[PDB]
Design a protein around this ligand. Sequence first.
Ligand SMILES: Nc1ncnc2c1ncn2[C@@H]1O[C@H](COP(=O)(O)OP(=O)(O)OP(=O)(O)O)[C@@H](O)[C@H]1O
Ligand SMILES: Nc1ncnc2c1ncn2[C@@H]1O[C@H](COP(=O)(O)OP(=O)(O)OP(=O)(O)O)[C@@H](O)[C@H]1O
Ligand SMILES: Nc1ncnc2c1ncn2[C@@H]1O[C@H](COP(=O)(O)OP(=O)(O)O)[C@@H](O)[C@H]1O
Ligand SMILES: Nc1ncnc2c1ncn2[C@@H]1O[C@H](COP(=O)(O)OP(=O)(O)O)[C@@H](O)[C@H]1O
Ligand SMILES: [Mg+2]
Ligand SMILES: [Mg+2]
Ligand SMILES: [Mg+2]
Lengths: 248, 399, 140, 392, 232, 238, 239
Amino acid sequence: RYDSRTTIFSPEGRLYQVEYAMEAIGHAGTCLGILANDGVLLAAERRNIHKLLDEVFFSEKIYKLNEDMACSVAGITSDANVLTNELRLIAQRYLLQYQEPIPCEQLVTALCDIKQAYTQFGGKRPFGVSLLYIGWDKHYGFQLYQSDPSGNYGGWKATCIGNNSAAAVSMLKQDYKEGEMTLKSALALAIKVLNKTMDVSKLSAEKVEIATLTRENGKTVIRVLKQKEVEQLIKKHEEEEAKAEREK
Amino acid sequence: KPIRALDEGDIALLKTYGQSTYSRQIKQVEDDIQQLLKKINELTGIKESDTGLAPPALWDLAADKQTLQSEQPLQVARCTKIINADSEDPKYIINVKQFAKFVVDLSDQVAPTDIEEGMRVGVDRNKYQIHIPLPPKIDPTVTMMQVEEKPDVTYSDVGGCKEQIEKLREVVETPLLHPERFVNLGIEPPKGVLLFGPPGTGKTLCARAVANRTDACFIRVIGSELVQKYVGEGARMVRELFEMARTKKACLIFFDEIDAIGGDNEVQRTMLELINQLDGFDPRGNIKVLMATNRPDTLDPALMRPGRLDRKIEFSLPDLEGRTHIFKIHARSMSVERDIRFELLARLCPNSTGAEIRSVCTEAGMFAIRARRKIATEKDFLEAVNKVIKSTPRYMTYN
Amino acid sequence: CGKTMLAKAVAHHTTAAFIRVVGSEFVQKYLGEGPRMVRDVFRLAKENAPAIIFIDEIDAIATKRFDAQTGADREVQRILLELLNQMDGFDQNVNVKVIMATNRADTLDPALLRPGRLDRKIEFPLPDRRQKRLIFSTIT
Amino acid sequence: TKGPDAASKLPLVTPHTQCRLKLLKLERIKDYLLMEEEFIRNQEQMKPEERSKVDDLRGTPMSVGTLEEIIDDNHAIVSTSVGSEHYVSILSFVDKDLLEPGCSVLLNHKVHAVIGVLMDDTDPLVTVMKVEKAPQETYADIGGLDNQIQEIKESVELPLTHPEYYEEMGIKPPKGVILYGPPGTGKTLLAKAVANQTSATFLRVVGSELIQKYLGDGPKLVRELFRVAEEHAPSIVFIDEIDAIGTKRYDSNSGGEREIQRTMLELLNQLDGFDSRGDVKVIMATNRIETLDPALIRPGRIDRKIEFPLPDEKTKKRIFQIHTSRMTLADDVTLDDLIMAKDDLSGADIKAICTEAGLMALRERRMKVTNEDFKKSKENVLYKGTPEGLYL
Amino acid sequence: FEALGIAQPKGVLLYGPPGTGKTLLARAVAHHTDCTFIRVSGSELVQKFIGEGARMVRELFVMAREHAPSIIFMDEIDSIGSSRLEGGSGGDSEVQRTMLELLNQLDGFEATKNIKVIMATNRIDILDSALLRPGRIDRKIEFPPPNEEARLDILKIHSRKMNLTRGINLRKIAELMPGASGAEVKGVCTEAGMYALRERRVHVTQEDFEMAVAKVMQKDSEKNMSIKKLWK
Amino acid sequence: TRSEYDRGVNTFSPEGRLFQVEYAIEAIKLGSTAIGIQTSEGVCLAVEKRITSPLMEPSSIEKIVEIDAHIGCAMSGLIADAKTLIDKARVETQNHWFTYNETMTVESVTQAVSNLALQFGEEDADPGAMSRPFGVALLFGGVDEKGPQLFHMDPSGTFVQCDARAIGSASEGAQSSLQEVYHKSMTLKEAIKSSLIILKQVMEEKLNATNIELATVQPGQNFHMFTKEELEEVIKDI
Amino acid sequence: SYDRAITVFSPDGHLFQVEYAQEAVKKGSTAVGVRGRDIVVLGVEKKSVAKLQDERTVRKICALDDNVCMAFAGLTADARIVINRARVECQSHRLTVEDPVTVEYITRYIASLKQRYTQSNGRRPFGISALIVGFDFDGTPRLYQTDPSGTYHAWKANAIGRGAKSVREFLEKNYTDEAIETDDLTIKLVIKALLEVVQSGGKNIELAVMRRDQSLKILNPEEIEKYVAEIEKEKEENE
Ligand SMILES: Nc1ncnc2c1ncn2[C@@H]1O[C@H](COP(=O)(O)OP(=O)(O)OP(=O)(O)O)[C@@H](O)[C@H]1O
Ligand SMILES: Nc1ncnc2c1ncn2[C@@H]1O[C@H](COP(=O)(O)OP(=O)(O)OP(=O)(O)O)[C@@H](O)[C@H]1O
Ligand SMILES: Nc1ncnc2c1ncn2[C@@H]1O[C@H](COP(=O)(O)OP(=O)(O)O)[C@@H](O)[C@H]1O
Ligand SMILES: Nc1ncnc2c1ncn2[C@@H]1O[C@H](COP(=O)(O)OP(=O)(O)O)[C@@H](O)[C@H]1O
Ligand SMILES: [Mg+2]
Ligand SMILES: [Mg+2]
Ligand SMILES: [Mg+2]
């Protein structure tokens, strides 16, 4: 059949290796990002915390790339690390060449060009990694982009990739009020999405990984939600859910 | 929004509400129509079969009563090994169709000489003794064994197989027409040839052409016939056809679709009988066998051994000149214009068998019929070859 | 580790009508004879008293269903499907307990490994410490 | 031979809009049916030696066998239905010229001498395989497939009607035609339409029906079917689902596979048996055309091959017009958004979409289907490609 | 249906994960119907004798037609009607003949009337396209694993005959079974009953249901953490 | 079993045949017919356009191209493969005009083009080159010191002097016709009439202005491609 | 067989990998370009964004230079790569010869790049088809279509992507000399060609127009509704 090296074309025109790289992301941890009026956030699931992981870390799924850049990863760990290192490399190369933080579109296109080159030629397996870039620029303010192992990308305001990503994005689009969400509403929506999309009746703060990017006073600050902060957020959501169910 | 089951009130309202005033009458009339049709079909019935009674001018009723009482019914059986009768063991194995096999004696009417292995023996119903041999009396005008004396197709009709037709000419004519040349060259005349090539190449037609030229009668035998119901006495079939060929003058035996026969108990009887009628029959006869099937290997290995079928003629898909000749041959029998570019059509159908060519001509005729024109045009042939052959890519990268 | 021995012991200490089959015995040469045998064995158990069906080496026929591409694989999956529909199909069985033993549970079809068909998947691990002592004492 | 015993074919009522004209036409048909039943019943009421002795000579009961050989004018080789065959006599009263290998001779129960011949023997299987009531579907009920309908009319209708063109051009009429395409395209509907408009005997066959358990019953059934078709000439044989027996020929090992191969070789032989000039045509339909034997579709056996592609946009809208021609649609239903959506909708899919839209309308306690009902129905009935984003 | 101008739907396919209610729904529709229900659960139409499956299909449909408007339940239709295999040799052909006879009976030349038919399977994707085709199978109903509310409803249905203790919260038990089929919920009820039985009691406590959920839903995970950490 | 020797160009058949090169040869039969005739007064090239759509711009379809003012080209095969071949031919002609400052003969032109061809099975392709045989047949015509000259180039890299050669989907029929209709002292005008006659006889569609591109090279004038009006004048006679 | 090898000729002389790459364009989205007396237009079928995708970065029509534009169909990533290479080559050609790149030159470069990507193993062919439009510096209307095979052709009004055959027949039946007399007539022609396949109108349609050297502005979503309203007005006018 036509399931050999990626540089092959099915008679119907499909790139089967690229398609398998697509469908492989469904095995990765669920991560989503939402665009709010005055902030952006990345919510990711810690699928593997058994009992004895040191948690010596800043974020596993979320990776900071530049003083204005942050992204979440979903795919094979090796390709994840390679893509993140290349992201840092290209961002700093743009900063050196132009003395300006790299735009989100430009960096995303650079990474996607690399990924396409990894499926265009050479007999090399495509990067089985899908990304969710978060950042700010003077060109378009706050932007969210969802990458793709095929080398495609798209500008989104709400997107979930990983396991159960289809249902998560479906309910998210069913429950997204564009242009009228602050950071708090976006955080609550992300918590509700993670509740509905993960296989736990009461998800813990350990399984949740949230990082928020916000531009304030001339500079953009990227911070991951501390343990106390994320615990307070999830408890606020569970009391909101309790209020909703008792009212019903 | 939960679906709500249609309540009885909703069912009642929805049924009547908006409806034709005539709708009730229409439905009743249609139902009555169906009931009336059923009633007619019930009251016609009982159509009389009227079995095959001849007019009373032919009924000798007393004689039929006497033949009913006297004439015994004999079951039909297939005989088998003679078990060395020689008047000391007058017994034979006979297989009474699906009933059973038995070992039976003769009858006073019959003699040992006309009973051997393999023919149809009429055994009785008590002792099962063979009471009359019933030769299949096949001589089959009701089925295959074409038995065509001088086929209408001639040397001009066959087109393209020039090398093939020349090899066939040699083998089945130079001994047949000039026996003295083979005699004075000290070589037995070619015992036969196996005409192998892809199906539809026309090997049958080329054989019939040489048959018409030799003025020797052409015998075509199918294999599926004696694979299907007429199995068993196929040995006697080929026995009697070879016999009548001996009675006949110079002949041309031709086995097509023989792959079915070659590819086996009664079948094995058929080819060992033809071994007896080819090796045992002197190879000097004028009953030359013309073997022909697509398969060059499925034939039993004991068949092409020397002293038997000696050469093989490899038919191949017609070339450009062959294809245009076939096109002209098939279009001669059609109402077309006189300026049809048959070379163009031959070019447009590469690697196309002769059957595909005749189908292309037929489709051109149908296309001409479609526009209700009595004469087929070149455009019709172009559309026909576009339809049959090929059952942007070749126009945008090649040029 | 004692599976077939426990089946033998159950057959010893039972007032039921015990039906012993091996999984491979179901697979027949003739087409449609395997599912027919499954139907007949379950019907025999049903029409009898409270009965027990023991199918040793169930994974011979109850391997996970896949896109069978040949007649033999289709027939084996047909045997498995007949087993499923006989165990928990349209017409339920009464007082018909079915025991099946296998070495590789993970290769069994998920439809076979669900409550209502296999309510209990009992693991028979290799003996540990105390179990080894008990086995040594009862054999010596 | 007796001519074509076509179907009943009650006259079609044209309005169909539940109006007075429909009532008039239906009442007229009912009136004619009543005067037919009156006549048949009253003529049943009004007005009331050698044959008995020949019946006595025949005896009781009389077995039915198939003639296979005739040695002399007073002896033949008949075969009972079981399979056994005997050398039997022919009594005088049996009309000889009717004796032809393959008939149905009437045999005495004891000493199975031929005492008569049965012109009509057709066994229950081949009898039900014959169409009696023409299907209500018609070419008007077929949307699109103009080329397909045109080809089928050229193949099984033009030789039946005025055929002078076929021999005027010198080409043979197309002996047999086969329809292929994805499931639900219209292969069986186009055969129903042919049966509705035919003037010849139509023989519907399931293909898998021809196969029979007992040895020799399959080829015998095929032979009887085509013998009826010829004897019922002109006739049309519709072997639907030919792939049930039309699969690739392979060497057989089991007895059942040998019998299947025997049945198909008999069918192929009898397809070769009749001349193309004969007024018996075969029509075969299948979804897996590629899995057929490349000898049943030989140009010398089945020249035509009518393709049934998934309907295009205009054919889709034609089918939608046909299946919504009996609905009480509103003025808002565009019906264009549905045929827009680049999907694999077929005629069956469009019909199911219409039915589901009607069911949505019923679900809203309304009998006027709207665009929203069609919208939900299309998603409801469509089951189950390229990842979104690769191909722009 | 007539006045609406639509054609009556004929067949429905009940597909979904095993143990969700497909055969249970067929049993219920058999219990609550005035039609002559027919159980022709799959692989019963597969006979050793040649061409007997197609004959059995024909007799089944002629009998269903002879009776009142009837319902035919083809349980585990995956068995006989799965997918026509190319060619023969090792490929299955007789079962394909039976399936094609069933297809023609369902929607062929004859257009059977009032012969509504129900089929069930766990693998709809492997079913043949000629069988899944609408007009032969409309309204392909999916049986997804129950959500929390449906799981609670199933628990309350299957705990109706038990002797529950005052203070039982079946809602918590339903929340403790993420993505659990209805069959597993019934198994949870049964195992809680058995935990009560082992201590020779008749009432069932919340702890019993908790251990029953733990036991029934116990499944083998990826023991090797290194394999599990391949993906981010 | 020819399949094992089918794959790859570096595999020898038991009969010693280069099957992939043979397939490249047969890939010419998918190109439109091109006819070139050699006469003492010059050489004429006639081709078949095979216009896919009346909307297409005819000038884009380049069956006949100019390698140099003194030489002409006709093509049949893959458009891409040809384009590379034509660019190499023009580059080599200009290289000769640079180094030797003379008009290089058409024989040397086809020699150089064949040198670019027949290089599929070579190790010099490391920087990047064709790993498969070129699938386009070349018809080279022009005038040189030996008078007018016509050369046909084989996808394998073989070239031969042909007095009248036809390549394309209809090489066999057009060549068979040219076999008996060609004559040595045939004039250029009657040669062009003969070429158009063969093209009309062999074309699938009727002969008009947009079905044929016509080129001619004579010792006096340079390479001339027949314009629309010249095509009408030469096609009204036929 | 002969299909899974880019540089292997089939027995009937076909490079089946190249044809498969060509066919992969048919799975894209329709894009029709028409050239007029003074205008060239690019009509494409825009995929309807569900609820969140930013249309600003789903660019289907892209400008290689100030004098050339192009619309692709068949693979977004390969399209992006060839777009970047095309603009890099346009800038490099303007560096080498200082005059703006003619449409023929950039089309030839794109075709040669795709060809060199379909002549060796380990290099998958660019599975897109491009419609190069623009004016040469002398002011002539030229439109070009590039095939994944690496070949290019001159078209007066061509369509690519899915349903390109139907739009092709529409243009064959409707491309007239007077139909391009004015810019509005060309716009009407291209809109009608698009609505032949994308029948909804309004949205799902993107147009870019090029008059004589003005740095084309893609028709923003304020007059596309106006232009389709004029189209409907004419449509009810003649019928
Ligand atoms: N062109 C059409 N116009 C109208 N209705 C159509 C058309 N094609 C199909 N249908 C509808 O589809 C239904 C089923 O089609 P049909 O029985 O002809 O399918 P088929 O192609 O023979 O399928 P299969 O080979 O899978 O049995 C018909 O009852 C009819 O209502
Ligand atoms: N929604 C439900 N409510 C109540 N009981 C249920 C439900 N779903 C399943 N069950 C129970 O689960 C058990 C499994 O049988 P069921 O008929 O439901 O299986 P199924 O879905 O048809 O599975 P299979 O595909 O294996 O046939 C039955 O005892 C049934 O009562
Ligand atoms: N060389 C040929 N010249 C003329 N007709 C031919 C030729 N070859 C095949 N045919 C046509 O093929 C048809 C029969 O082919 P046939 O001889 O049965 O094929 P096979 O080679 O399998 O015997 C005839 O109608 C005949 O006209
Ligand atoms: N718990 C046990 N106590 C005593 N003997 C045992 C025990 N388990 C296994 N054995 C020994 O091993 C054998 C059991 O084999 P068996 O149970 O058939 O293996 P399987 O698990 O493959 O069915 C018995 O013959 C017995 O002698
Ligand atoms: Mg054991
Ligand atoms: Mg059908
Ligand atoms: Mg079930």
